[PDB]
Design a protein around this nucleic acid. Sequence first.
RNA 1: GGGCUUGUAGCUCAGGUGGUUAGAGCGCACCCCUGAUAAGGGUGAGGUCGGUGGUUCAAGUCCACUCAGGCCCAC
Length: 917
Amino acid sequence: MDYEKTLLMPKTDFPMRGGLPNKEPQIQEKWDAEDQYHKALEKNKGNETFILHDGPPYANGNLHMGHALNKILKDFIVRYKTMQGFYAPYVPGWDTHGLPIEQALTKKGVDRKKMSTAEFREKCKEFALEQIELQKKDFRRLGVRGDFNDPYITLKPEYEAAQIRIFGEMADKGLIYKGKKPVYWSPSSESSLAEAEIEYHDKRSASIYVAFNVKDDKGVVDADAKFIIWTTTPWTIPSNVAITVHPELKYGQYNVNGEKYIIAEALSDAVAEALDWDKASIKLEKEYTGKELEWVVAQHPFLDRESLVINGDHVTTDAGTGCVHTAPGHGEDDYIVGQQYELPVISPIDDKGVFTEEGGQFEGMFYDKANKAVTDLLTEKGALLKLDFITHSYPHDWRTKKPVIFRATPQWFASISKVRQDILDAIENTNFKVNWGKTRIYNMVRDRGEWVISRQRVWGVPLPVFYAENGEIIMTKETVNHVADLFAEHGSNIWFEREAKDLLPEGFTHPGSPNGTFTKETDIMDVWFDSGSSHRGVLETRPELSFPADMYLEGSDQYRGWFNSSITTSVATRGVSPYKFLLSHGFVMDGEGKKMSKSLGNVIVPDQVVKQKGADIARLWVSSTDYLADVRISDEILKQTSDDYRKIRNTLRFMLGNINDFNPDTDSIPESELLEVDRYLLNRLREFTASTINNYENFDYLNIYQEVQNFINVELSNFYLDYGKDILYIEQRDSHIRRSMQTVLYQILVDMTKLLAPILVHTAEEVWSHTPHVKEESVHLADMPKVVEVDQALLDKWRTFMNLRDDVNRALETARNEKVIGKSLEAKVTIASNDKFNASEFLTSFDALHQLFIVSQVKVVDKLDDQATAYEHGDIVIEHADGEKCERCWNYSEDLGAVDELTHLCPRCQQVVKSLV
RNA sequence: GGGCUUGUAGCUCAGGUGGUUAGAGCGCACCCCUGAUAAGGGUGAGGUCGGUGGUUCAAGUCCACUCAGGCCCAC
Ligand SMILES: C/C(=C\C(=O)OCCCCCCCCC(=O)O)C[C@@H]1OC[C@H](C[C@@H]2O[C@H]2[C@@H](C)[C@H](C)O)[C@@H](O)[C@H]1O
Ligand SMILES: [K+]
Ligand SMILES: [Mg+2]
Ligand SMILES: [Mg+2]
Ligand SMILES: [Mg+2]
Ligand SMILES: [Mg+2]
Ligand SMILES: [Mg+2]
Ligand SMILES: [Mg+2]
Ligand SMILES: [Mg+2]
Ligand SMILES: [Mg+2]
Ligand SMILES: [Mg+2]
Ligand SMILES: [Mg+2]
Ligand SMILES: [Zn+2]
Ligand SMILES: [Zn+2]
């Protein structure tokens, strides 16, 4: 007859293959339907709280692997805290203002000039919300649990109003002020431009050398040797302002003939070389320290009146002559280092290349031809020049293809310098996972210049400022807070819909404008300000949250980004960091650790990992990366992830099928009555559990990925589950020995699925769904197993038994290569003490060595002759087992018997079978 | 160029105060099993630690320089 019918084979419909791309949507569908997000919250209703504040991704485009890495790590954290009983609301957010979106619309074919600000802004909003829906869909497909149905958005009235109140408070503490800054300006478009509207094209520029003297006397500290000058911009000459000097680097030359001017060290060679001067390459003499040449007061001719100073510099040396000269009226950093000191803003020029003030003969022409021929009047006619024509790449208006120039424009600033030390101190009191995180942002805030907070665009939050003709600036608590009031109720659009007096309080009045009339600012705030105020607009505003967030977690680029604008803004108005803990991760690279491009074809997108392999696979990958640095993804990397996932899943499947008939409520064996081998695994489970919780407490998911594998592969699959077959399949269903293993098997099943739940969200649920008798619905609404003390002596004892098992297996291998044995069951193992190990005594405290080694018989003797091979754990002798093969359990027995139609059954199996019938 | 950061076996990772033949899991090779079967067991082969030079009796582990990466600036 057939023996398999009497066997107890595993039973479960839990599939070996995941089918993730088709199973996960259903599971997600159910989680939403049963509003688990809010259920998870009410489950921990009055417990300690954990607030992880989400940084708002930009509402434009497709999520990339970075969004996935970042969101999945966040979910790990909140899920684990939730599973430890913490009330941990996770509310995603979206960054919705900014130039990029205005551009998307324009590129889409919207066209501002043809509808008005109000209609264009609504178009931006409509677009942002559409993008959000798409992104929200993708985020949820990763298995992330969060308030996705009621996320915070920077375009929401309440958020905008909060942002305004932040602007108001900073303005009150005197941290907001109006000034000016140079910006790309297109005389063609009669408007300023951002780098995104700039494209380079070669241009004909007449470069000249205007060597200017060093009169006065304050600068005659070292002779009266003139200071040369070279500008590729003749119109950038009527801007008499300082010169240059890169501290440390010195040299002055002072050479024969001419006037013994000044060049430089690494410059000299490539300086006079083109100066046409080479009257016997005359040698230098009295070089006078560059760096130290500060305040070397020098009158710069051409029709000057003021002498130009010189201060520290940042980047000057190169093919470009050592003589730079400045004029904050038309220069990027030419304005920074050139302003700290009493410096008057130079040059005019209206929205058109035309100027007026200070302009001599050229009082109404342009910045071009009015130079190359006009201003070229004032040149070598006293400053020794060399009018040359050169070609180089130059900034151009991308639509008009015409040249762009720098021009100082009124801008608004946030006074970082006044709150600097305050931010530094808040950082010092901020916790970090790694010390360099603290150092990076520290030096950041330390070397940070003033914050330009204004932009001349329409898609954003308006600076709540009003102007009173007579002078200007109306920015008081009353005015800002009333604007906040309106914004809170109508949103920012109100600003573009109403007149100034409608945006002002109760029939407001001010000394300015005796006629009760007012003007309003038009600039909007920099988007960094928008997100940077998220701690106010969401943490302080929403009921479920609390201002100081337990932590912020984002990419490395946020040290200059959201981490920075958020702390700057929070310290300014609250005096504290908006985050008690700052955790950052790296970027996602390809397999070689190189940037994903597209021209290179090494991208890999989240949407594809999910569709092709599954969200649970994208997640396991995350847990396996050392996120504190850059991480790497590729097809070979993911094939690995797939292979580990299959092993975890398959192992869980086997355990599931073998506890299908186990009812914990009535079949469990007391710990004190478990077979010792079962108590050993129960303790390996406790050890693995303790270790994993610790890892979760430290955000060390990589350690869990590593340990889970070793526990699943080595302890379970390789050993316990294998050895268990001779028990689970053969013993009587309700026998003490079978129920003892099931008792531990069940606990491991349950606990391990719970311990993995934060990571393998879908599979954990699917396994939970196939486990009999689990209390709660959903693993995700259950608590982590409690950490208990392990029996260390039991562990050491079995650790040694395991190392002894390896020697046996080695002995079994040798014998198997010799065809002496096939499966380990056809073997008889004899072992005895060695000089290296007292095997005989040690093996005395173990039961059923034959089952433990998966062999038919084990004989412990005491001593073996010089036939037995020696092992680290004793001498071992392997030979084919005695007796005949029992057709049921496949162990060899010398006492096979028949039970009715079933022959060749060992005594053990005869008993099990007889109890069937 | 500046701040911070990474480089150990095919892959992902371990390797306190420097000290015998650098560890793990997977993968791979070969063998066994065929009662987890688009499964399972076993053995074994692979790194000299990005490079060079030093400190030291002795360095993956300390120093210097260097190569190739990464984020953010300077640009
Ligand atoms: C880890 C990251 C990128 C990455 O890993 O790079 C992924 C690879 C890019 C894909 C390449 C495409 C081809 C392009 C080509 O051709 O070159 C960065 C992080 O991202 C996630 C989150 C985004 C939020 O909005 C940011 C917020 C906080 C602030 C308020 O704005 C944030 O945490 C951010 O710091
Ligand atoms: K088999
Ligand atoms: Mg680790
Ligand atoms: Mg294995
Ligand atoms: Mg390597
Ligand atoms: Mg490697
Ligand atoms: Mg590492
Ligand atoms: Mg191996
Ligand atoms: Mg080498
Ligand atoms: Mg050496
Ligand atoms: Mg020596
Ligand atoms: Mg060491
Ligand atoms: Zn061109
Ligand atoms: Zn039997």
